[PDB]
Every structure is written in structure tokens, then in C-alpha cells.
């Protein structure tokens, strides 16, 4: 659903603002790596996390 790239903002829930850095995956599943509390590798689509 939620489809993320470099360079996206978001902001989630817990850790506020990131910036997206890395994206793996496809769908429900995909990952990303979120620089915020630091780099966070999560699965977005399973996150309390908005597109900015």
C-alpha cells in the first residue's frame, strides 16, 4: 500500500520526523531504512508512520 522512496519524510508516532534512506521489498512486507533515536530499519506498512 504505502509506497516509500529516497528521500521521503515521514513521520512516525513514536520517533517523530525521518527521512527515508533506503527502501527493500515490495507491498505489504517492504522495509526501509528511516534516519530519525537514529537509523531505524522498520517495515512501514506495519507503522504507525505517515507520508509527509
Given at each position: 500500500s504505502?509506497?516509500?522512496q529516497?528521500g521521503?519524510?515521514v513521520?512516525?508516532?513514536?520517533y517523530?520526523?525521518?527521512?527515508?534512506?533506503?527502501?527493500?521489498?515490495?507491498g505489504?512486507?517492504?522495509m526501509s531504512?528511516?534516519d530519525?533515536?537514529?537509523?531505524?530499519?522498520?517495515?512501514?506498512n506495519?507503522?504507525?508512520?505517515?507520508?509527509?
Open positions: 504505502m509506497v516509500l529516497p521521503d519524510r513521520t512516525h508516532d513514536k517523530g520526523l525521518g527521512r527515508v534512506e533506503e527502501v527493500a521489498g515490495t505489504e512486507s517492504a531504512l528511516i530519525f533515536a537514529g537509523r531505524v530499519k522498520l517495515m512501514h506495519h507503522a504507525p508512520l505517515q507520508k509527509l
